Amino acid sequence: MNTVPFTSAPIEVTIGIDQYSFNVKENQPFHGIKDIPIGHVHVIHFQHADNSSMRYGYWFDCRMGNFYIQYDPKDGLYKMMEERDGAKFENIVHNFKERQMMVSYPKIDEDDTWYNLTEFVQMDKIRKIVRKDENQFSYVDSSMTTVQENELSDPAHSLNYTVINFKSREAIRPGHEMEDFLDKSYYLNTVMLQGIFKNSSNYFGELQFAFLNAMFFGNYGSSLQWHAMIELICSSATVPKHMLDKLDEILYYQIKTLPEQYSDILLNERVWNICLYSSFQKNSLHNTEKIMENKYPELL
């Protein structure tokens, strides 16, 4: 089990850790989060009490370093940092634990929710989407635009998701215009899976990461990416059986986790109705279709 200590909490803030959260008070004696499960990526995220504008946060993997949070009064935010002095770090953490100055990552044992939302997500791929190589962790916030959004402005602060565009020369083979536009299997399997992602695990990891950035930061471009990657599969007549089975599970847990009150802004009516009811895979997503129909039948 791993730990992310906090130097202090000088400003009132709601702190997220994965799918959990809690409001902390100005200068309330908070020194971090312990018992964080090893083996998964994690995200620690923030919404200040005084400006619920700009949710922001850090993706990290505790296996890659000792990380802590420290508020910066000049830049006005909680910053993640790496402590390279391992002895200094273990000493700080042990003192904070002894003084029970840390909340506990509250994983219920029956619960595979986080695993299921991050099954294919890997820090090395996050770090390619979010470019900042001097750190082992990755900052994301509400306002960051994607490379594709920038095409349609600061490149250092962009989300470099893989660009998907159904009306593009990459998507459409000369001479198969109608075939490739109505059945996107070529673009899914040859262009994206074999050509760019190499395997479906990397594709599912980017899709899962885009969902989580849409849900935790309200990042609009990430929501667009999540739906495009769903729609590309649902609009392909030829998809490996194992990918459809896994997609159904992936989407099931995403819909299960989504705040009921945000379904109006994080779910695209057109894509979901197309995917569940008109697409080639309309009959292939049984778990996802059942939870959608029972939880958000208005959208459909």
Place this chain on the structure above:
Amino acid sequence: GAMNSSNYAELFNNDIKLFVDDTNVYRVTVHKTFEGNVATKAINGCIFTLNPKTGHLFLKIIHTSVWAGQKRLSQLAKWKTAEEVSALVRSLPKEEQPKQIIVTRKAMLDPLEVHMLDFPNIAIRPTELRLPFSAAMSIDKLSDVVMKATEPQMVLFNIYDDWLDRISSYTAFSRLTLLLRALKTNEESAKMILLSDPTITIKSYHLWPSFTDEQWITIESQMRDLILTEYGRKYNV
């Protein structure tokens, strides 16, 4: 974006543009089978591609053989239209290629956009105008060349005959759409109007009769009357 009443004069500026109408590409007769089921028999069709400034009409004739063994013909027809129009644009010298293509039906937007990805700078636009180009097959000479074709073929016409010698392209387009609107509303009446006088003939190289300016005003009045009439006959007014 879309072409409508507010930006109508753009049709007659000096940026090359084409209308594309696909309503006569896939044409059928519906009939009963020996067993008393219903079946369709395709007949020859045509893409109606028109430069509204010059009158140049690129009639791409769609022979029934192109449907043999194909499924979902109404959907294929839109893509075949987009395939033929993109072939026409490639066929034309760079300085003759259009800077915009206006499709008369919104279901042609995605087929055409996808076929024209090689031409990112040609704008593909819909329109809110309800244009009457479906009535092109009421022009006898166009219907004849379509129905006599035994293979695919593109025939070139000027749909304005020599009118531009005497009138502007705005006035020429207005006359054309009035004639075609009339032919669409009541073909028999409209054709009676156009041909009732045997002394006014259609030149061999023309589509419409050789009316004097004065005679066109009479004709145009008669076509307005017809359209108004039918509108009452239809709605009882």
